[PDB]
Symmetry: C4
Subunit: 23 residues, 4 copies
């Protein structure tokens, strides 16, 4: 559902933040 | 606070930054 | 809607594919 | 053919590969 989609996107956004900080 | 749509736009923009950084660095 | 979410995820997956191929 | 949920799992896995590659390379 919408909650599950939101929660997976939150994981996606945290991984993106780590990747960009590792530049 | 962010909608699904806003999060997807954030993901798309972050990937655009990563893609440019990797492409520009490999030169 | 669900269609818009799917279409944005398709853009996300294409960008990921380019990033990984640029390794 | 892929659901939203399957696409999100694909995105999460691709990011895990990118994250490991960048972290391991910076060493």
């Amino acid at each position: 559902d919408v909650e599950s989609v939101n929660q997976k996107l939150d994981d996606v956004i945290a991984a993106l933040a780590r990747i960009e900080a590792d530049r």
